[PDB]
Design a protein around this ligand. Structure first.
Ligand SMILES: [Ca+2]
Ligand SMILES: [Ca+2]
Ligand SMILES: [Ca+2]
Ligand SMILES: [Ca+2]
Lengths: 79, 48, 98, 314, 52, 48, 49, 53, 53, 79
């Protein structure tokens, strides 16, 4: 264990709270990001109809990237 | 370190510069790339 | 006044870096064991905890030192040179002697 | 030799200890060095952005180039009218060339370089004690109209003078996580459209290659086990402590440091001449000083009982 | 920033007003070392701040 | 000069004002038109 | 408190000026030899010194 | 006094000549930065506003 | 007598010890005198320009 | 002679280094002016076709000013 000044990975090694819910994966299994409510997308980040945060460059790149395929739907980017 | 002449050279444009300024290189703590260092004050400035 | 030069850090992802010897002034070199560094764009190494960082720091002459510099001198015996204005009769002579 | 070809150089992103939001961040206007050795109170500021040049690197007094947050390593140009220097209040811009600015700044505990408008509005504050500097043995707020001329060293306002050089080094790798997909349990390499990306993976063994399309990788279960960068970039960058160096960090070129410290003459105040009261083996000096003034005395004999005092008031 | 008063203003419009009260706003630091702003390298100390 | 009463008058609107304020007129140095002067402080302000 | 009245300077371009006696409070007058004064518009005299 | 170009006589440089206009007649302050007229008599007085009350 | 007729007066150019460029220059807003005897912090400034006309 | 803090005109007198190269004719032969690269010509000062600074008032006043007389040229001012 470790002090409340540190957040425990689900591995055994604990990183500080400033590194938790900061948009950066610094847990081996990512248990420091996929628990907090910071679901915001960046200024340049495209948003799927499914809510996933995908880079804007990935949109209509020719290959499906997002779970629902909205990134490559003909409606979302005309072809 | 911290005294007049902590850095010495035969000229201003010489390549034989010798110095002893107590540069301690610290272990990086932040994730962003960083060289943390601590140093003594300039002996020239202190003598000034 | 010295100017601290901190070169760009050298990182090796899965590997070890050695501290070499350089002739620069107050060259300090240290190697750190596990870093996992970040730039703008995320992690810069794939390796989890085997990332080695090499920190270098030497000192130089500040650019403004061509004006704001001090010269250390050792001064030996001093010598007196006098200028005289000897007047004998109506003639005035100007001479410089040791 | 020292070159002035800024088409061969590029700006970069530093790590400013104090951005607009009062937190460390990655900035295009990071302040590397601040020099205050000018007797008139001007400072030399080194910035990760290049001023006085346009995007292509050609000379343009009204333009400055900087590194974008975009994942394509782009260089954007904006007007110099958005560049503001401040210490406690706004400072006056005296010149700009490359990474260097010259500013007339009031005293303060910090130096701030700002982009005051536009999409890339940002600030960089570094800690630096800018004090009031005066020449001679008498204090002043600004140089007077009447006085004597004294030797002082100032920063030349001309950008064609050099006070040294700074070393240009080859740009290092820059891994971007926008090139990693991690679809279900597999990692996919995403090049930025028509660009070549070199990847490194430690998914069991060391894998490296240059690719231009989607790549399935081998045995890579997570995106943290791979990095991907572009080796297209060739423009030289400064020897900054916030970039990862190249495998070949030899000096590729040198750039001038403008605004050389030159000898000039300043106007310094002449104090109110004192009234001398003469008594037996001594004098009295009735001294009028509005700002601190130096009184130095010494006996002209074997023992000079030297006195030095800073006098204010009557 | 530090100062001796706090002012709230409406900077334009018909209701363009102001209000100044006397209050000593000082520079605060955490720990046994003074700073102007928090550094980049250091240790992590327990501090109490106002949640945004 | 420099003390209380350096300027004296029988009234505020009198025409017989007497003063001794140590006005030294200096040689002009700049090319622009200038009367350069130096003077003692106000004895009234010092006494205040 | 006293107000130091400095009148508009008088310059004679090729000629001599003389100090006169005046009864104002602490009236100080001095005459300087070679000036060549400048205003916004250039030199104000035709002589050199 | 002239109202057009004048060649003058025996002058090789412009520093040996000065030219001014006498049209200006509006009173000015007794300022240390102006060269006085040959008649520096008080032509008028102006109020100093904002009395200490 | 004290006049309030500013058609008889004109502004002038002074010598400011500190202009915008941190050097002395000839200015139309030269500050001649500053008076601070008010107990509420107000000051009186004399300027080579004329305001309100 | 005199110190390097002054400029020696070709007359026998030296004026301060600031007085040289500043737009005023200071030496009896104007040596402090006709030496520099101060080709900047003022805002109210029109620039003649021959490269000389000539004040805007002289421009097509009815009398030639420049060596080439560009001020009186009918192309510059319709007449
Ligand atoms: Ca994290
Ligand atoms: Ca896609
Ligand atoms: Ca000149
Ligand atoms: Ca003409």
């Amino acid at each position: 264990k470790c002090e409340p000044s540190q957040f425990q990975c689900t591995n055994g090694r604990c990183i500080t709270l400033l590194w938790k819910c900061d948009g950066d994966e610094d847990c081996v299994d990512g248990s420091d990001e996929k628990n907090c409510v910071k679901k915001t997308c960046a200024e340049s980040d495209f948003v799927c109809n499914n809510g996933q945060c995908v880079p804007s460059r990935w949109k209509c790149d020719g290959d499906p990237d997002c779970e629902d395929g909205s990134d490559e739907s003909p409606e979302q980017c005309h072809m | 370190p911290g005294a007049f002449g902590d850095i010495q050279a035969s000229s201003l444009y010489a390549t034989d510069i010798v110095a002893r300024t107590d540069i301690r290189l610290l272990k990086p703590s932040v994730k962003n790339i960083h060289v943390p260092y601590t140093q003594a004050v300039s002996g020239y400035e202190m003598w000034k | 006044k010295f100017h601290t030069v901190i070169p760009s850090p050298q990182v090796k992802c899965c590997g070890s870096l050695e501290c070499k010897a350089s002739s620069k002034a107050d060259y300090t070199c240290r190697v750190f064991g596990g870093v996992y560094p970040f730039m703008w764009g995320g992690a810069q190494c794939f390796c989890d905890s085997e990332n080695t960082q090499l920190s270098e720091a030497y000192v130089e002459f500040a650019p403004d030192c061509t004006i704001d510099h001090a010269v250390a001198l050792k001064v030996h015996t001093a010598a007196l040179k006098v200028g005289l204005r000897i007047v004998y009769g109506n003639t005035t002579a100007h001479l410089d002697t040791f | 030799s020292i070159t002035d070809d800024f088409t061969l150089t590029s700006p970069y992103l530093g790590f400013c200890p104090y951005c607009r939001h009062s937190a460390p961040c990655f900035s295009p206007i990071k302040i590397e060095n601040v020099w205050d050795e000018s007797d008139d109170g001007s400072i030399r500021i080194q910035v990760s952005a290049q001023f006085g040049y346009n995007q292509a690197g050609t000379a343009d007094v009204t333009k400055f180039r900087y590194m974008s947050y975009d994942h394509d390593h782009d260089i954007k140009e904006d007007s110099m009218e958005k560049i503001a220097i401040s210490t406690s209040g706004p400072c006056r811009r005296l010149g700009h060339k490359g990474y260097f600015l010259l500013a007339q700044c009031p005293p303060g505990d910090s130096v701030t370089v700002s982009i005051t408008s536009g999409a890339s509005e940002n600030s960089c504050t570094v800690e630096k004690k800018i004090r009031r500097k005066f020449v001679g043995r008498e204090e002043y707020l600004f140089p007077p109209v009447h006085g004597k001329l004294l030797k002082c060293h100032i920063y030349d306002h001309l950008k064609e003078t050099s006070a040294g050089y700074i070393t240009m080094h080859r740009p290092g790798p820059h891994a971007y996580k926008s090139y990693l997909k991690e679809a279900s349990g597999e990692v996919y390499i995403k090049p930025p459209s028509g660009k070549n990306v070199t990847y490194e993976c430690k998914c069991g063994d060391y894998s490296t290659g240059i690719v231009s399309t989607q790549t399935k990788m081998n045995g890579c279960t997570k995106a943290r086990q791979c990095i991907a960068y572009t080796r297209d970039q060739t423009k030289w960058v400064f020897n900054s402590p916030d970039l990862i160096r190249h495998t070949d960090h030899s000096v590729q070129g040198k750039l001038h440091i403008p605004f050389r410290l030159t000898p000039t003459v300043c106007r310094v105040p002449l104090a109110h001449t004192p009234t001398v009261t003469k008594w037996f083996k001594g004098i009295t000096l009735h001294l009028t000083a509005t700002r601190p003034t130096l009184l130095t005395t010494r006996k002209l004999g074997l023992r000079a009982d030297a006195t030095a005092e800073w006098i204010t008031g009557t």
